[PDB]
Structure formats: structure tokens, C-alpha cells
From a paper:
The cap intermediate is methylated by the RNA guanine N-7 methyltransferase, utilising the methyl donor, AdoMet, to create the mature cap, m7GpppN, and byproduct, AdoHcy (S-adenosyl homocysteine). In mammals, RNA guanylyltransferase and 5′-triphosphatase (RNGTT/CE) caps the nascent transcript and RNA guanine-7 methyltransferase ([name]) methylates the cap. Human [name] is a 476 amino acid nuclear protein consisting of a catalytic domain (residues 121–476), with homology to other eukaryotic cap methyltransferases and an N-terminal regulatory domain (residues 1–120), that mediates recruitment to transcription initiation sites. [name] also has an activating subunit, [name] ([name]-activating miniprotein).
In order to characterise [name] lobe function, a deletion mutant was engineered in which lobe residues 416–456 are replaced with a GSGG linker ([name]Δ416–456). Despite the absence of the lobe in this mutant and in thermolysin-cleaved [name], the crystal structures are not altered significantly compared to [name]–[name] (RMSD 0.5 Å). Moreover, no substantial differences in the position of key active site residues were observed in the crystals upon deletion of the lobe. Removal of the lobe significantly reduced cap methyltransferase activity, over a titration of [name], with or without equimolar [name] 2–45, indicating that the lobe has a significant role in catalysis. Since [name] can partially activate [name]Δ416–456, it activates by mechanisms additional to stabilising the lobe (discussed later). Many lobe residues interact with [name] and deletion of the lobe considerably weakened the [name]-[name] interaction to below the limit of detection in GST-pulldown. Deletion of the lobe did not impact on SAMFP binding to the [name] monomer, however [name] 2–45 was unable to stimulate SAMFP binding to [name]Δ416–456, consistent with a defect in [name] binding. Removal of the lobe in [name]Δ416–456 leads to a significant increase in flexibility of both the α-helix hinge and helix A in simulations. In agreement, the average isotropic B factor values for the α-helix hinge compared to the whole protein within the same crystal structure displays a marked increase on lobe removal (average B factor hinge = 28.2 Å2 versus main chain = 23 Å2), in comparison to the [name]-[name] complex (average B factor hinge = 24.4 Å2 versus main chain = 24.4 Å2). In summary, deletion of the lobe reduces the catalytic activity of [name] and impairs its ability to bind and be activated by [name].
Author numbering: 167 to 440
């Protein structure tokens, strides 16, 4: 209830993001579309990927509960007696920061048209080795022209609020962010707690985007675009197709607290070169 409009927005944002890049891929492949969802969670991107008519989906999360949970969502959608075609899926429980997904694939020679990391990548930055391995699992299997897309905290905006704050903690009634130490912002291992209304689930790490961009180059990825949630909304809402979708999802106008929570995050996408 409290977080309603914010919940809606992220699924609007993720749908518009996926929809955009599924078109860019369809301008090339338009067949056997393979996708890797990193940190798939309990699913929820499933219905998004079905909408885009994906031919294959690899869902992976470090939590075995979320993976088995996500697998039931797929099966539930899959097992209707209807005609509707659903992507061939795959479910892999692994730590993508510390593990190599290539070993866990049914087909280890598998290639992906799209890799979606939604509110995940910031977890991998605990260390360089971890942060690089996550980029590896994602981008190494992208066939050229494929996209690495996702969403992570800004880290310009995060520190900006921290430095303005009197204590290490900052936020509002709908969310609370607590850094372990203020003023020290190491490229890796910079650690803070992200607590939505609820209990804080796991610590996050600071992702400075210029760094993520540099490390992505290792895997031959060039940045397509990087935009804050504010910039993304302003632009993509220009389309009156998308504006209908947001009012349909009943997202959009939130409390000043909800609108504050967003604009911390930024969407991004990379493209694999030859
Ligand atoms: N190293 C890791 N490997 C895989 N998943 C991870 C991970 N670290 C965190 N995660 C997962 O990141 C997710 C955060 S939220 C769920 C994101 C999902 N794409 C959605 O939009 O619903 C959690 O599921 C968490 O288990």
C-alpha cells in the first residue's frame, strides 16, 4: 500500500526498457531469441518476457528459494490448457559474482541476445573479482549486437544525500539508506544498507558507473546509453503508447517520498561488439 506507486513504476520502467531493446534485437535476429535474466528473483519479469515472445530464458539467482519459486511462476503460466506459446526456460541457482554460469548451462556453448540484470549488479561490487565475474557471466555470452541491460543505484546521487545527511543514515519514511562509513568511497567494497519499508534484505555496494563502464569493456561491451530514472521517465513518457501503460499499471504520480526513492537508480545498456 505505502509503496504502491513505486512498485508499479519499476515494472513499467522494466517493461519499457525490455520492450525497447527487444525491438532492437528483432531488427537483427527476429528468431531463436535467447535471454539471460541475472538475479531473476522470484520471477515477475516472466510475464514481461512472455509479452515480448522470447524463445528461451535462463533465470538465475543466488537464493535457491527465489529460483525454485520463480520456476513455479513459469510452470503456472506454462500449464494453462491454452494455446499461448511460452519461452523455453532454464533455472540455475548460482552466485554469479563468485561462479561461472557457463559451467551450469544445459548448453555450455549457449549464446544470448539479451542479458537483463535488474537491481542486481550493485551486489557484485563487494570486490573486483566478484564485480568482474558478474560482468563476465552477463556479457561474455552475448553474441555480437546483443545487449547488456539493467538498473543500479546512481552513486552520484547516493553520496550526495549521504554528504548532506548529518549521520551515516539518510532517507525518508518509505526508505532508509545506512552507510557503514561516510566519506570513504572505495571503488569496491563500499558497503551500505538499503532498507525499504520492511526489514533490510542484504547489504548493497556502491557502483560508480564510469567504473562499471570500464570493466565492461573487458568483455567488448560499448555503452548504448545510461540514464537516471528521472531522465528515462521524461523521455519514454513522450511516447503516448507508454504513457497509457503507466496509467494502466497505475504507477506514475506517487508521494514525494516515493518519487525521492526513484531517481536514486539509473537504467543502463551495453552492446557487444565484434
Ligand atoms: N550474486 C548474485 N547472484 C544472483 N542473484 C543475486 C546475487 N546477489 C543478489 N541477487 C539477487 O538480486 C535480486 C534483487 S531484486 C529482484 C530482481 C528481479 N530482476 C526483479 O525485478 O524482480 C535478488 O533476487 C537477489 O537474490
Amino acid at each position: 500500500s505505502r509503496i504502491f506507486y513505486l512498485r508499479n513504476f519499476n515494472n513499467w520502467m522494466k517493461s519499457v526498457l525490455i520492450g525497447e531493446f527487444l525491438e532492437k534485437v528483432r531488427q537483427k535476429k527476429k528468431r531463436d531469441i535467447t535471454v539471460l535474466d541475472l538475479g531473476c528473483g522470484k520471477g515477475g519479469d516472466l510475464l514481461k518476457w512472455k509479452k515480448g515472445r522470447i524463445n528461451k530464458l535462463v533465470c538465475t539467482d543466488i537464493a535457491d528459494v527465489s529460483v525454485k519459486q520463480c520456476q513455479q511462476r513459469y510452470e503456472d503460466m506454462k500449464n494453462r490448457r491454452d494455446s499461448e506459446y511460452i519461452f523455453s526456460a532454464e533455472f540455475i541457482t548460482a552466485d554469479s559474482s563468485k561462479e561461472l554460469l557457463i559451467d551450469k548451462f544445459r548448453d555450455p556453448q549457449m549464446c544470448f541476445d539479451i542479458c537483463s540484470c535488474q537491481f542486481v549488479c550493485h551486489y557484485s561490487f563487494e570486490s573486483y573479482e566478484q564485480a568482474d565475474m558478474m560482468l563476465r557471466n552477463a556479457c561474455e555470452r552475448l553474441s555480437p549486437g546483443g545487449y547488456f541491460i539493467g538498473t543500479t543505484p546512481n552513486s552520484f546521487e547516493l553520496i550526495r544525500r549521504l554528504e548532506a545527511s548529518e549521520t551515516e543514515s539518510f532517507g525518508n519514511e518509505i526508505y532508509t539508506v545506512k552507510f557503514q562509513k561516510k566519506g570513504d568511497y572505495p571503488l569496491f567494497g563500499c558497503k551500505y544498507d538499503f532498507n525499504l519499508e520492511g526489514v533490510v534484505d542484504v547489504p548493497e555496494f556502491l557502483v560508480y558507473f564510469p567504473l562499471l563502464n570500464e570493466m565492461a569493456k573487458k568483455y567488448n561491451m560499448k555503452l548504448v546509453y545510461k540514464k537516471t530514472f528521472l531522465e528515462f521517465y521524461e523521455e519514454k513518457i513522450k511516447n503516448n503508447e507508454n504513457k497509457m501503460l503507466l496509467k494502466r499499471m497505475q504507477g506514475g504520480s506517487g508521494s514525494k517520498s516515493e518519487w525521492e526513492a526513484t531517481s536514486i537508480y539509473l537504467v543502463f545498456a551495453f552492446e557487444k561488439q565484434q
